[PDB]
Ligand SMILES: COc1ccc(Cc2nn3c([C@@H](CCCc4ccccc4)[C@@H](C)O)nc(C)c3c(=O)[nH]2)cc1OC
C-alpha cells in the first residue's frame with residue numbers, strides 16, 4: 533500500500549497548511565478530500581502534541597490510523613468520513629475550549645482515539661436491528677445491551693492487538709489499563725440509552741459546577757464531550773445538516789426495507805412509507821441535540837456559538853417543514869405518482 537508509504541516517509545504536515553480555518557468551529561471537515569484525512573489525523577495529534585507527550589512511534593501510529601480507516605464500511609452515514617468529522621470536532625474542542633483546564637492529558641488523548649474508533653465496522657443498522665434480525669452481534673452482546681457500541685470497542689481492541697498497530701504498547705501497565713478503560717467507557721457513551729441514563733447526573737454536574745478534583749465529573753464530562761462530537765454535524769451550517777439528514781435517513785430506510793423483507797414491522801423512523809423527516813429532525817434537535825449543547829455551554833461559556841447554531845438549524849426545520857406537503861403539481865407536472 534502506497535498510502536502507508538506516503539504517511540510514513542513524507543513527514544507530518546503542519547495543521548495550518550490543511551486550511552486557514554481548520555481549527556475553527558465554522559470549518560466543515562467533510563470538505564477535506566477523503567485521501568487527505570489520514571494525514572490530517574497525524575497533523576491534529578501532532579498539533580495537540582500527543583505524539584511527543586506520549587512518545588508515540590510514528591510508523592505504528594501511521595499503521596494504526598490506516599487500520600482504523602479501513603475498519604469502516606461504506607453505509608450512507610456511518611462511514612470513515614463520519615469518524616473523521618467526529619475526531620475533527622474533538623480537536624476543535626481541544627483548540628477552542630481549553631480542555632486541559634478540565635481533563636487530564638491522557639483523558640483527552642483517549643477521547644480523540646475513541647472518536648476515531650467509535651463506530652468501527654458499523655453496517656448501517658442500529659442496536660434493535662441486531663436483536664430483531666438475530667445477528668451474530670446480538671448473540672455475542674444483546675444480554676449486556678449497547679450491541680453495536682460493544683462491537684465498536686471490540687474492533688478497536690482487535691486493531692490494537694494487530695501486529696505493528698499497538699500505539700500504546702510502551703505505556704506503563706497502569707496507563708495501558710487506563711487507556712483501554714477510557715476507550716471502553718467513552719465508546720459505550722455513544723449509545724443514546726447510555727446518554728439518557730446519565731442525563732440527570734450531567735444536569736447535576738452543570739448545576740453544582742465542574743469540580744476538577746472529582747473523578748466522577750471527569751468521567752461524566754468525557755461522556756458529554758463524546759456525544760457532542762458524535763452529533764457535531766448539527767453545529768455546522770444548514771447545508772451540512774441537510775446533507776447529513778439525507779445520509780442518515782437513506783441509511784435508516786435501507787434498514788427498514790431489510791426488516792420488512794424479514795417479515796418485521798420497522799419503527800416509524802426506519803419506515804420510508806411512514807417516517808415524516810421534519811417532525812423526526814425537530815424532535816431530535818429540540819429534545820436530544822439542543823440539551824447536550826446547552827449543557828456544553830453551561831460548562832464552557834465559549835461553547836455558546838455551538839448551541840446557537842444547533843438552535844438556528846432547529847428553527848430552519850420549522851421554516852422548511854411546509855415543503856414536505858405537495859402544493860400545486862410536482863416538478864414534472866405529473867400526477868402519475870398517484
Ligand atoms: C426522536 O428521536 C430521533 C429522531 C431522529 C433521529 C435521526 C437522527 N439521528 N442522528 C444521529 C444518530 C443518533 C444519535 C443518538 C444519540 C446518542 C447519544 C447521545 C445523543 C444522541 C444516528 C445517525 O445513529 N446523529 C445525528 C446527527 C442525527 C440526526 O440528526 N438525526 C433519531 C432519533 O432517535 C435515535
Ligand SMILES: [Mg+2]
Nearest residue numbers: 650651680722
Ligand atoms: Mg455509534
Ligand SMILES: [Zn+2]
Nearest residue numbers: 614650651762
Ligand atoms: Zn457516531
